[PDB]
Amino acid sequence: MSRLEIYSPEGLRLDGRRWNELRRFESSINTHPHAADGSSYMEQGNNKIITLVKGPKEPRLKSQMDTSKALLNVSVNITKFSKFERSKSSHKNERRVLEIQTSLVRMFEKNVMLNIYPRTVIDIEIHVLEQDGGIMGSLINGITLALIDAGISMFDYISGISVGLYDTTPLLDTNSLEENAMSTVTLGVVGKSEKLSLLLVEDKIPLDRLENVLAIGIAGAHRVRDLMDEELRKHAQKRVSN
C-alpha cells in the first residue's frame, strides 16, 4: 500500500520520468591517473561511483600467483554516507557485500582475457559515494569503463540495468523509492546480445511477468551500452587528436 503516485494514470513517475526512460547517465574516463592504471567516475541518477583498476601488476604474495591466468579481485566500498540515513556500522565484511564482490568477479572472469596476463594481478577498487537505487547495475558499468581505460583486453561491453515491476507495470531504471515499493530485477547484458552475464532477482516476481521484465531490461541495457560506447569514442578522439 503506497500513498504516493508511483505510476500515475498520466504515465508519469515520482521523478517525472515515464515507464521506459533511463536516468541521467554521465560517464567519465581517466579520472584518477596517478592512483590507478584505469579509472572511471560514474553518475547514473543520484548514484556516484568511483572505480579504480590497478594492474596487471606483480602479486604482493607469491603464494597467490597463477601461471596460466591473472588474478582478478574486486572490493566494493559502500561508504557510510551513501544513503540518507548514515549507517553506524561498516559494510566491508557484510555478507551482502561479499556476494556483490564475488558476483562482479564471476562476471568479468568470462569477459576479461585473464589468460593473456599470466603471473599478474588485477585489483579493482570501488567507492560508492552516493546511492539511490540500481546500485548493482551502476557497479557493472563502472567496472567495464575503468577496465577499458586501463587498456585491459576484454571480449565485449557488459552493461548493467535494473527493472522494477509495479503490479503489472514495468519500470526501467529504478530509484530507491521505487525499489522500496516493488520487486526489481537486475540485469548484466553482454554487448548488444541477448545473453545475460548477471540475472539477479531478490524479491517475489510472478513467473508470467519475468520474461517481459527481462525484455525491458535487455533493451534498456543496450542503451546504456550505447551511452558508454559514445562517451568512450568521444574521449578517444579528444586524446588521439592531442
Partner: protein, 295 residues
C-alpha cells in the same frame, strides 16, 4: 597564492592515413586472410577488437594498438629500474611493467671484473652488490614467453646509479633512440629509460668520455662527496621542466629538455615551475618554438 595555490569549484565532483578508433566488441574486418595480432580476437571470418584503440595494419598482420597500457619491454631497450627483491642467484627489478624483470647473477659485472676469480660465495652475498631499493641502468637482454624481460648490466655504461635524483614520467612520453644517456648544460647528465624511469645525476668522467681500483666501487651507495649547490639546483630545475613536459603530454627528448631548461630561466625561483599555468606555458612555448623553427 603567496604560500599556497588553491583552485576551487562548487556543485561538481570534478571539472567537466586516418586512424580508425575502435572499442571492445567492435567488428574490424571480415577478411579471413588476415593474421590477427594483439588487441584483437576472431571467430571464423570476423575479427573483433579486444581493447579501445586504433586499428593497425602491418603487412598481413592486423592488430589494434591500445590507447593506454603499461610499458611493454622490447628486447634491447635501455631501462632504469629498482631492485624489488633478491633471491637465489638473481634479482627481481621493478621496471614499471606488468611483471618484475629478472637480473641473473651471471648477467652483471662483479666488482674487480675480468681479474676476479669465480667464487661460490657470490651467490650467498648478492646483497653486497645489489639490494632492495637500489637503482640501476640495464638493457633488456631477452624476453620470456609471457613477455617478461630478462635484464643485463654487462657493460660500463650500465650499473648502479648515484650522484643524483630519481623522477618518472609516463613511458609513452619516451621513445626508443640511438642513445638514452645525454649530457646537458649545468654539468648534469640525464638517463632517459624507455620505461619512463628517469635518472638525473651530476656529469661523471664516463659521461664526458662518451662523446670524447674504480671497478671495486661500482656498487657503492656512497655519492660524490663534492657536489656543488649549482649542480643540485640544476637537477631540481631539470626535474621540474621534465615534469612540466610530462604534464602537457609532450614527448621528452634531450632537445626538449635543454630547451625547456633555458626557457624556464625566466622564473627566478625554481619552485615557480611546479604551478600549473607555468608548466602549461613552458610546454606550449616549446611546441610553438618548434612550429616557427620547423616551417
Amino acid at each position: 597564492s603567496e604560500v599556497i595555490t588553491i583552485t576551487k569549484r562548487n556543485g561538481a565532483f570534478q571539472n567537466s592515413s586516418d586512424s580508425q578508433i575502435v572499442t571492445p566488441g567492435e567488428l574490424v574486418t571480415d577478411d579471413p586472410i588476415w593474421m590477427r595480432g594483439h588487441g584483437t580476437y576472431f571467430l571464423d571470418n570476423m575479427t573483433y577488437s579486444s581493447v579501445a584503440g586504433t586499428v593497425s595494419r602491418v603487412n598481413r598482420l592486423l592488430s589494434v594498438i591500445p590507447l593506454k597500457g603499461r610499458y611493454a619491454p622490447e628486447t634491447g631497450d635501455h631501462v632504469v629500474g629498482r631492485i624489488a627483491e633478491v633471491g637465489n642467484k638473481r634479482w627481481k627489478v621493478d621496471i614499471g611493467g606488468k611483471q618484475h624483470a629478472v637480473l641473473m647473477l651471471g648477467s652483471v659485472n662483479l666488482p674487480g671484473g675480468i681479474l676476479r676469480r669465480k667464487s661460490e660465495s657470490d651467490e650467498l652475498q648478492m646483497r653486497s652488490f645489489l639490494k632492495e631499493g637500489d637503482l640501476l641502468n640495464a638493457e633488456v637482454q631477452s624476453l620470456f614467453q609471457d613477455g617478461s624481460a630478462s635484464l643485463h648490466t654487462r657493460s660500463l655504461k650500465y650499473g648502479k646509479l648515484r650522484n643524483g635524483m630519481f623522477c618518472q614520467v609516463p613511458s609513452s612520453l619516451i621513445v626508443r633512440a640511438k642513445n638514452h644517456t645525454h649530457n646537458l648544460p649545468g654539468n648534469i647528465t640525464v638517463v632517459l629509460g624507455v620505461n619512463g624511469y628517469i635518472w638525473l645525476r651530476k656529469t661523471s668522467q664516463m659521461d664526458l668520455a662518451r662523446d670524447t681500483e674504480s671497478s671495486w666501487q661500482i656498487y657503492s651507495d656512497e655519492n660524490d662527496p663534492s657536489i656543488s649547490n649549482n649542480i643540485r639546483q640544476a637537477i631540481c630545475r631539470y626535474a621540474n621542466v621534465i615534469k612540466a613536459l610530462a604534464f602537457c603530454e609532450i614527448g621528452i627528448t634531450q632537445q626538449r629538455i635543454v630547451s625547456a631548461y633555458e626557457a624556464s630561466m625566466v622564473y627566478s625561483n625554481v619552485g615557480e615551475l611546479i604551478e600549473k599555468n607555468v608548466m602549461e606555458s613552458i610546454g606550449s612555448d616549446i611546441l610553438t618554438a618548434e612550429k616557427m623553427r620547423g616551417n
